[PDB]
Design a protein around this ligand. Structure first.
Ligand code: NI
Ligand code: NI
Lengths: 120, 120
């Protein structure tokens, strides 16, 4: 009855969708969620509305939307909550959208940065 | 002799620079680097050229540039390597720039995503 929907920026290059895809597969490997979908905000399919619809059609009533972004910006504060109809201007009927928080300045990010700095 | 320069997208909102700042402070807390600076690609100061110059002025000869981005895109593949003069068409002379890789689909990111999914 819960779905994880991972949402990404999307690009004209393919690396953004590749990332969402690898992440979704990695969370699928962890067996924690009934349903797991990805959506991209601009330029790529699936789109965020499509991903949400797909999760409802598989029978989820609680949709957990996690924005896979480092920081808040225009997309996480306006565009995405719009697309999800959480803010005025698709149609869910009797499900609840749970819009989570971006990655932010997590200690794990600093771990990744130090590794990356040393080429690991 | 080595500097870490963390580079971010930058935004018209403040959250992007806030993130770089928190990250830089967190890597400062770990005492691993002689010198640590941040740069933002668009809309914010310091800029990437400024951050690089600032690191040279403090006496670094090896500048480690880490792009704090989830995925490769136009900025990490063209704009940033341009700004750093790694790519034809930004005044080092006897120092070397070491341009690292973005975060990518790291297992740590999946940890953060699951936490974020549960509102932690
Ligand atoms: Ni954008
Ligand atoms: Ni951009």
């Amino acid at each position: 009855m819960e779905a994880l929907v991972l949402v990404g920026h999307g690009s004209r290059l393919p690396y953004s969708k590749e990332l969402l895809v690898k992440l979704a597969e990695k969370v699928k490997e962890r067996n924690l969620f009934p349903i797991v979908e990805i959506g991209l905000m601009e330029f790529s399919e699936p789109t965020i509305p499509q991903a949400v619809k797909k999760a409802i059609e598989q029978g989820a009533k609680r949709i957990i939307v996690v924005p896979v972004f480092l920081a808040h910006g225009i997309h996480t504060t306006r565009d995405i909550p719009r697309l999800l109809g959480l803010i005025e201007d698709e149609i869910p009927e009797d499900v609840e959208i749970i819009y989570r928080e971006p990655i932010g300045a997590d200690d794990r990010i600093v771990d990744i940065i130090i590794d990356r700095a040393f080429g690991r």
